[PDB]
Structure 1
Amino acid sequence: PIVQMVHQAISPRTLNAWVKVVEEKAFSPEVIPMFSALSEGATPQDLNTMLNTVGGHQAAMQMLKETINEEAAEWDRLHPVHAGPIAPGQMREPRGSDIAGTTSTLQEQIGWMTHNPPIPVGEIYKRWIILGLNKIVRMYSPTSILDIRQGPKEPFRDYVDRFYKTLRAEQASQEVKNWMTETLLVQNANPDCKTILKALGPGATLEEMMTACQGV
């Protein structure tokens, strides 16, 4: 990576941490923030390193490649490379494959990221990767948010855990996710607690809803 801006190689325990995360948790939603955390300031070389060191899950890793290729193709459409000799004081325009690290050197990647103005190929490629990770996470989620219903003897707290866990893996914008909160959470509660929450009105906090069905 590059620390704020001097270049550094990816650390053994960063590498190891990422490997263990995928081994232990597969593609559970929290893996993605972990990935981003472990890739702060990462060059495409470091990002590819993290991806390539994953054994197994090669259907997902292939899916991720395609997503990255789609995003790369789109970048090329919007940003066409122009014919001409790259002047002494300047550096060339990056393609999608240069951003994905496959067709660019470490020094070129360092060049784009540090040069003024900054061309953050690390952070661009990272967004493409996270995009592909979301597609995987969402596909690899077994349950739908519509199916999360509170059991008759289930403590509300456990139902809310399942609800927002499943919600975290849903393919939905924030406005849609807002609708799911205000509609489904109360709708799919068990009869006893459902009554209790309906009596609070449709503008009570989760704290208030959780403390309300705490006894029941």
Structure 2
Amino acid sequence: PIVQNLQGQMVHQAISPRTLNAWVKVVEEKAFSPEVIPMFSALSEGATPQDLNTMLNTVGGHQAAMQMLKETINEEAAEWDRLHPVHAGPIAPGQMREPRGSDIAGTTSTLQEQIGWMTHNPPIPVGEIYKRWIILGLNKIVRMYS
């Protein structure tokens, strides 16, 4: 997540492998009972898209479910692109490209671009937007399994 250091300074902080273990566990104890969703929200506060993927990439097996989730992410990334057409022309000094769906999902964006969008004024909250897509996929899995 994005966090602060002891001198008051904005720093990205890698995901606590303790939050990670709690999560993975949850998904393996509860399979995909309704309680995984609040858990995921609880555990992913302030997450960058990179952190979110680290979370998902750790889920051991549950291949079919993870695939449902990926399909949902992909559909949402395509919708985002459809609703946010790119303006023509070269990116101006001290600005970033407007994120594409795949940027939001972490696949074509760096940590540092993620942080730039998130901490910009006004921000594009790429971690919150990706988190919403993931929770929709989680909802789909929970509807299937319980």
Common fold, TM-score beyond 0.5? yes
Q: How many residues align?
A: 139
Q: TM-score, normalised by structure 2?
A: 0.91
Tell me, yes or no, if structure 1 residue 2 matches structure 2 residue 7.
no
Question: Mapping of 1:36-115 within 5 angstroms?
Answer: 36-115=41-120
Q: Secondary structure of the equivalent of 1:6?
A: strand
Deviations 1:125-170 (A, max 9, x none): 000000010011011xxxxxxxxxxxxxxxxxxxxxxxxxxxxxxx
Would the aligned equivalents of 1:22 and 1:54 in 2 still touch at CA under 8 Å? Answer: yes
What is the alpha-carbon root mean square deviation over aligned residues?
1.2
Deviations 1:99-148 (A, max 9, x none): 00011000000000001101100000000000010011011xxxxxxxxx
Q: Shift of residue 5 of structure 1?
A: 4.8
Deviations 1:180-212 (A, max 9, x none): xxxxxxxxxxxxxxxxxxxxxxxxxxxxxxxxx
Residue 119 of structure 1 is matched in structure 2 by 124
Unaligned 5+ segments in structure 2 are 4-8
Would the aligned equivalents of 1:5 and 1:114 in 2 still touch at CA under 8 Å? Answer: no
Q: Secondary structure of the equivalent of 2:60?
A: coil
Within 2, Cα distance between the matches of 1:62 and 1:9? Answer: 25
Unaligned 5+ segments in structure 1 are 140-216
Question: Mapping of 1:67-216 within 5 angstroms?
Answer: 67-139=72-144
Within 2, Cα distance between the matches of 1:5 and 1:82? Answer: 30
Write 1 or 2 for the structure with the bigger share of helix: 1
Q: Secondary structure of the equivalent of 1:92?
A: coil
The percent of aligned pairs where both chains have the same amino acid is 100
Within 2, Cα distance between the matches of 1:10 and 1:30? Answer: 21
